[PDB]
């Protein structure tokens, strides 16, 4: 069979099923069994078989539009998607990655590869807005799909397409990377609201690869160097330790191998 498929829809609004979903994702992203201070580390990209390297997240609308997303199980980041018979991939910034993404949606008809990557500061352009100004929650997630599905048909502009990218990633990838950011989405939902992310989050997003590094190279959990994030008040502050982050960060990109 093909890569695993974790199914989710914005029709049934249950704020539980959202959670059961993010936990389905995390369950596929790693096996656990490697955990640094109770925080699971994603599988090491080195030696990892391509048949094991991707995950598929399918997403349904209330307009009943289905779009399948591909994530890299090493970074939990979206490498591309599939809507209808057309498949679109982010730019594979290295040779080895280029090879691997060709194992995705092999049976799709039209395979596109963008000239751009999937990193924020890049999409923050095409969208024309910024993460700070871009709306999230279950609201943008219905429209983020109707964008992607309708991109294959040229019915969605690129600006709103990169905008639709920025919504997806944060609400899947980052949600699964952080318990904190995961919880933040349920909130916008249970009361059915929609809004933009606070510095608490953004600083977490920019810092995820940073923290993973800091945590795994830490001496007994103590960061060799501090790291500055922000809270909703915008106030900056530093983390000297893995402790605080346990309720916050869920998965870590493999950085090093475990100590004694």
């Amino acid at each position: 069979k093909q890569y695993p498929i974790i199914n989710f829809t914005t029709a049934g609004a249950t704020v539980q099923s959202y959670t059961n979903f993010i936990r389905a994702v995390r369950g596929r992203l790693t096996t656990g069994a490697d955990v640094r201070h109770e925080i699971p580390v994603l599988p090491n990209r080195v030696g990892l078989p391509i048949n094991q390297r991707f995950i598929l997240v399918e997403l349904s609308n209330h307009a009943e539009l289905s779009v399948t997303l591909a994530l890299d199980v090493t970074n939990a980041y979206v490498v591309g998607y599939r809507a209808g018979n057309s498949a679109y991939f982010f730019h594979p910034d290295n040779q080895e990655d280029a090879e691997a993404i060709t194992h995705l949606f092999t049976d799709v008809q039209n395979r596109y590869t963008f000239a751009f990557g999937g990193n924020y500061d890049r999409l923050e352009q095409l969208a024309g807005n910024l993460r700070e100004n871009i709306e999230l929650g279950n609201g943008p997630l219905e429209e983020a799909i109707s964008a992607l599905y309708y991109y294959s048909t040229g019915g969605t502009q690129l600006p709103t397409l990169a905008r639709s990218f920025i919504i997806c990633i944060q609400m899947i990838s980052e949600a699964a990377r952080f318990q904190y950011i995961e919880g933040e989405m349920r909130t916008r939902i249970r009361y059915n609201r929609r809004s933009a992310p606070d510095p608490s989050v953004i600083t977490l997003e920019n810092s995820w690869g940073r923290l993973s590094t800091a945590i795994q190279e830490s001496n007994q959990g103590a960061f060799a160097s501090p790291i500055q994030l922000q809270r909703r008040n915008g106030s900056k502050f530093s983390v000297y330790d893995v402790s605080i982050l346990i309720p916050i960060i869920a998965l870590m990109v493999y950085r090093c191998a475990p100590p004694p």
Partner: nanobody
Framework: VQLVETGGGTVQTGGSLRLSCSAS????????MGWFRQAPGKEREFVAAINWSASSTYYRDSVKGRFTVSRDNAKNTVYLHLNSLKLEDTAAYYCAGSSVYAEMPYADSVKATSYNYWGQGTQVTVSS
């Protein structure tokens, strides 16, 4: 990104010439490039296309195994090598990249609609 084309001019039946297009700035080398041509009073034709890598090349049926398209992302130029020139090939040759896609399905690669930026169209004529 802006394109400039080189080569092109008087050639004789069965000869060779090499067209090149140098891109200064922009996303080039993350971009798919393609070559198109038109003779006067004749239809616009797809000639060749090449992706970013570039591991995928497509050629107009009539030119298959005659023309070869190349690129150097380090030199920021894309090459169209024209060998064994038939009279059929007399035309102005245009090079066009797409800043949106590093690669395209070839349904899109064959159409000039899919490319958002062009060169100035160096002229090519084949005598005999």
């Amino acid at each position: 990104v802006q394109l400039v084309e080189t080569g092109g001019g008087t050639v004789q039946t069965g000869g060779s010439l090499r067209l090149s297009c140098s891109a200064s700035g922009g996303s080039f080398s993350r971009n798919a490039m393609g070559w198109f041509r038109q003779a006067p009073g004749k239809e616009r034709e797809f000639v060749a296309a090449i992706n970013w890598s570039a591991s995928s090349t497509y050629y107009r049926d009539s030119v298959k195994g005659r023309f070869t398209v190349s690129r150097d992302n380090a030199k920021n130029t894309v090459y169209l090598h024209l060998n064994s020139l038939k009279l059929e090939d007399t035309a102005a040759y245009y090079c066009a990249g797409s800043s949106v896609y590093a690669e395209m399905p070839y349904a899109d690669s064959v159409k000039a609609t899919s490319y958002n930026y062009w060169g100035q169209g160096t002229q090519v004529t084949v005598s005999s």
